[PDB]
Paper text:
Gene transfer agents (GTAs) are DNA-containing phage-like particles produced by some species of bacteria and archaea. The genes encoding proteins that form Rhodobacter capsulatus GTA particles (RcGTA) are derived from phage DNA, which has been integrated into the bacterial genome. Here, we use cryo-electron microscopy (cryo-EM) to determine the structures of RcGTA before and after DNA ejection, and to visualize the interactions of RcGTA with R. capsulatus cells. Particles of RcGTA have heads with a diameter of 38-nm and 49-nm long tails.
The RcGTA head contains a special vertex in which a dodecamer of portal protein subunits (Rcc01684, g3) replaces a pentamer of major capsid proteins. According to the convention established for the portal proteins of phages, the portal of RcGTA can be divided into the clip, stem, wing, and crown domains. A dodecamer of adaptor proteins (Rcc01688, g6) is attached to the surface of the portal complex exposed on the outside of the head and the adjacent part of the RcGTA capsid. The adaptor protein can be divided into four domains: the attachment domain composed of β-strands 1–5, the tube domain formed by α-helices 1–4, the adaptor loop, and the C-terminal hook. Residues 175–197 from the C-terminal hook of the adaptor protein interact with helix α8 from the clip domain of the portal complex. In addition, the attachment domain of the adaptor protein binds to the α-helix formed by residues 148–152 from the extended loop of the adjacent capsid protein.
Author numbering:
A (entry chain B), B (entry chain B), C (entry chain B): 1 to 23, 36 to 171, 175 to 197
D (entry chain A): 199 to 393
E (entry chain A), F (entry chain A): 24 to 79, 90 to 393
Write the structure that this text describes.
Amino acid sequence: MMLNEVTAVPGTALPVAEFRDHLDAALLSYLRAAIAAIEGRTAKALISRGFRLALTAWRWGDMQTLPIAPVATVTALRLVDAAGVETPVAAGWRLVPDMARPRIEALGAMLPMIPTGGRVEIDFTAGFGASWSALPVDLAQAVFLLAAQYYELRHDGAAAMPFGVMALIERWRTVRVLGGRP
Amino acid sequence: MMLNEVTAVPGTALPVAEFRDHLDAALLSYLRAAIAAIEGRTAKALISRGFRLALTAWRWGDMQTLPIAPVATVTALRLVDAAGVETPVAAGWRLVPDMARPRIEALGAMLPMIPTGGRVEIDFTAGFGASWSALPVDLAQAVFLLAAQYYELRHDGAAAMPFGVMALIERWRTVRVLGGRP
Amino acid sequence: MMLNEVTAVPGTALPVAEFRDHLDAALLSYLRAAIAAIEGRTAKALISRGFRLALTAWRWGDMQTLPIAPVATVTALRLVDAAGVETPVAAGWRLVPDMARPRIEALGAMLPMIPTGGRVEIDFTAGFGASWSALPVDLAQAVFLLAAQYYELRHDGAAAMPFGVMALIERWRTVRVLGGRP
Amino acid sequence: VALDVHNAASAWSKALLDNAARPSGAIIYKGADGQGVLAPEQYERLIFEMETHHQGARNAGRPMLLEGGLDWKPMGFSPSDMEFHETKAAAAREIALAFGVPPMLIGIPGDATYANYAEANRAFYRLTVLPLLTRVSAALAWWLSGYLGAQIELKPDLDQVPALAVERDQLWARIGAAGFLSNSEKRVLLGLPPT
Amino acid sequence: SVTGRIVAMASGAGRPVWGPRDTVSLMRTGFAGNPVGFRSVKLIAEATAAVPLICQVLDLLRRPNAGQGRAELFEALIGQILLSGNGYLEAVCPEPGVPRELHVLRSDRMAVVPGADGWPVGYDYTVGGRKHRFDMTGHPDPICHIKSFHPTDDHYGLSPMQAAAVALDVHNAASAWSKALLDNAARPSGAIIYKGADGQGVLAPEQYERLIFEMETHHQGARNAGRPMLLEGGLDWKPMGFSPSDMEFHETKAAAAREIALAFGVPPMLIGIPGDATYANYAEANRAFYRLTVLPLLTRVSAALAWWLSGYLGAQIELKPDLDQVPALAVERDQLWARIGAAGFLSNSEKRVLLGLPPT
Amino acid sequence: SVTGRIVAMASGAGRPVWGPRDTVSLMRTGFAGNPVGFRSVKLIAEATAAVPLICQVLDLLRRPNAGQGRAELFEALIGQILLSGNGYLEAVCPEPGVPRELHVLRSDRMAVVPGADGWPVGYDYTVGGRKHRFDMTGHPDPICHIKSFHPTDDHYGLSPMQAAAVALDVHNAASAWSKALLDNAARPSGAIIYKGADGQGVLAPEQYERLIFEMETHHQGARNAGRPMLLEGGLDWKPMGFSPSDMEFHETKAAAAREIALAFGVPPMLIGIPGDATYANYAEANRAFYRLTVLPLLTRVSAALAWWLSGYLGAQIELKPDLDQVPALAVERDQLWARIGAAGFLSNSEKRVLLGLPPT
């Protein structure tokens, strides 16, 4: 399980013209330092970037929930071998769109099996929308409340409002209570 | 269970002329960052926007309460198959209007069954009213007490009045005490 | 188990032009004093430098997880003898890319055995990317929030913001709960 | 319901022995800051001095010198025995109550009701075996008599059952010691042919 | 018979209906895994092999084959009925009657095949990937199939082990709870906390070699139990405890070990399970053992031997357990002999017939 | 027999199927490692060697070879069946009948070889790297192989030790828990804390020599138990305790030591395990011992001696345990003699035959 992303965000899709109004190479260096700080706390994606979840063993036989939460259109399920013949499979599973648990529910059967050495990888385009105007606005507001902090103070210095950064991203974090075996 | 909304609010229905009096591209960017912050704490809708609850399995057989609370006029219950033949059904259930539990109570029978792969989806127009003058005024006041905070302070800085933002939205939040099995 | 690095970072790959904008021999002396402070807390590498893990006994027979977490392309597994005849082996194991546990899973067999005196060593190029623009931006932001502190205050003096240095590197640290026998 | 309690209270402890984390302790490493992880050069050292010198039966009591920042907080396991123990026995005794077996015969652990198996076995063959057998053999007697012509009776024989010997010997001692009536009159009281 | 034609097809005619499964995964964890499931089978199977049998073919039973003898055969036969609910017996017969050898075919490598009507057409002994395929389309029927009662299955029996398969998993794990806890657990007798002048500070190797030598020599062992241990500024001795010391799953391991004995039918006195006494003094614990779970089990195995072996010789034979030659029923036997012995009203020739003695 | 050809190949024909393994790792930790596994085997093997045997060849059994005698042979034979589940007997015979010597070949250095059909073709005694390779392609069959019952294996037996191999690992470790804890544990009687004028401060060697001499002489020992110990400014006496003092794994070591006795079949009264009483007064604990786990074990070993030694002389011989000459069955014997002794209705010549006496 790696989940490295395919393509980074272009920077033309980030609202550097809107962030300037709220407060270009230094402004855009602070939104994506605040987009990546909010996604890492909320396990979200916010810009619909492409990913590659390359994992070695399926956790269940009708599961392996995806960590990046808002998903749509799993592109492929490439089932590689050790030498890398790279034969993709095209049937057997279903992307089940769910903000709670984005999972691969399969089709009433065990998920595609993995060769000895050949790690199965999933490429999917997960996120809210391709632009900035497609986000939930409070999660878009939480980026501006954090990126304006990184702009207005440079080192780790000192200064809680009712709906702050933490109170706006408390409802996008993954609420999990299983530290168990399954 | 996704519940992505069909159409966003136009912005012509937001009271940017009234918010200015209480204190246009920067004012309207702060109400919907405070409308979406209050709806996410109260699970409300406030502007009667359209939704699509696309879920994979019915929780009960005379239930599946809807999360967005003030509902009216469930438009359709589209019961799709895996290939997407998209055949809507038109009978068997009742929208039961309730601010506590907006639920589909069915008609003395099990709810419409879901095909293997074909996720059932519900499109409904939930909210108080189509304009801003149809809201409860305290929930309209709580938006202005929050959006004037986002206007008057830009990063997560420091500063509780008797009826504040939290005391006005404490009576619209969903009071739930079931973390159980059903 | 030593893990000394093969080649240090050149300094041409460090963003001394970007660090200056955020705030050259004194600036670059403060990023790598803040890169090495964050890698030592997060057990990461951040610049894809080359390493040599020279250890004396394999902890398991299908394991020996690597400590530096983001790995790619284990170059060789040199299996030396006591006099140093230096015969590398080329088969039997698999690099399993995992941010959680970068491990050598073997190939359904015990890992290559070590001679009496001849310590087995692993050379691998672990890290995110060869440049600075390939990092996760919050881990790149945490370097700038720390290196601007080392710039702006010289001795151990006095001064916590919501996403500070510690809140940004809390999600890259190795979360371990085994102080046991295996 | 008593089966569903005895199945689940026994599968309570089956699961609890298969998915439960007790530690013997925890070596808390806060560090110089409020939090701080310890390096892989220090985590390999901390395991080797915990595996070799501090774990096992042969290391039960090593002093475990703790530096600045390190700390050993020993965890307990406070409910150790008896997870649904007297409810599993109370359910297992309500199962035996329904079928009619006394709890002595199957071995359910409980306050003794019968004394010494001479009356636990005698109550078993009198309350829930011989009433059950005299209804099955009586339906065999009527149904099989619809096949041959003559009506037939077919009932349990108490004489050839070793559990009723404590019933039988106090009968034979009752009219055996009754010497006032004659010998041919006490053979007929026991079911013996007079000679 | 009529339901023969309708239940056979509904199961798959002419194909092997394999065993219930998990029987091996219970034999190696419930008969070779814990002593309570081990001893309970070995107590019953060595009891049924000890009770003599009377004929109302004995040279076949007293010497079956070149290996296992009369007592080794029934230890092997009942040890399959108690483990898997099914007892099998191969007979080889060069002669047209009274077969030469009896072999207990083990039941986990044996499956039925139902066939056309009712009773099965053969049995498949599958070891590795090779099957034998016995035949039952004849009179002598070379495999005897002794079954325990199974209310839902038509072709196999229910092992008392399958009933107590959770109580075996509790007694295996609660005993492997304490095996592990004695092998991976850190208790210290204490901890010498060295904070230092700062909030934290390690102590030098010149000081760590001194601190061990004064802890090894002067403060550890039985011969140093109570040394004062002067503590300077900064040093501290916080003695650790071990608060649950005894009894990690102790009354649940005994409660599980008593539910294993409840399923097989052994009383807890005979194997030695520690519990509230039920029977008194082994004269009635052994008498209840040979009456509730040995002699009912032996009178079903010998009755299937009596019918199956009578298909080889011409005359129908009966073969049932002999209670007279079993020392556990002496407390039954002496209160019988004292009942009609003290009954002096009937004659001497009339009380010999009440005991099973020939009148003279 | 027919399954002979199909189970033999599925196991590997003509190659040695070695022992189960771990038998040695149980002999040196469960027979020489703890007393409960030690005494339980030595109690049974010295009981089976004490019961006399009757012939229904005795000079062979009373003097097998130049070393071990009649009682030393059966202590060595049953001590292999209880430890490894397999008893082996070599016989050397210069004469064509009734062999001269019997040798208990130890079972952990012995493996079977299955061969072509059914019963094994030989046995391999492998010490070091040298094998002997016995042969069974003949009638007298020089190795007797007494087996305990094994439900899943075809060629070996199950040691009661393999069943209780976790209960041995708990009784070894809980006893080595307290062995270690008495050898590496620091309890102090107290600690004289010297913080000093600062937050920390050591005390000088001129003051540390004074503090020892007033602690050694005036405050330690039995003769100084209660001295006031005046404490100045800065000094402090914090007395340490030792909170779990007794009973470190005490009722789990006894519960494990009772599950070892449960597997071998010894009652806990005979070896002295401390537990709730099951039997009453040793007249029934010894009688249950010679009836549940000694005489069933001896009637299987002597029955395999009776068949194997009858392959050397011409006539088939029977050789079974004699219950009459065993002092543990006197409580069985006296209630027999009082049963038909008090039965005065039958004659004198009819009650001599009920006891096994010759009528005169």
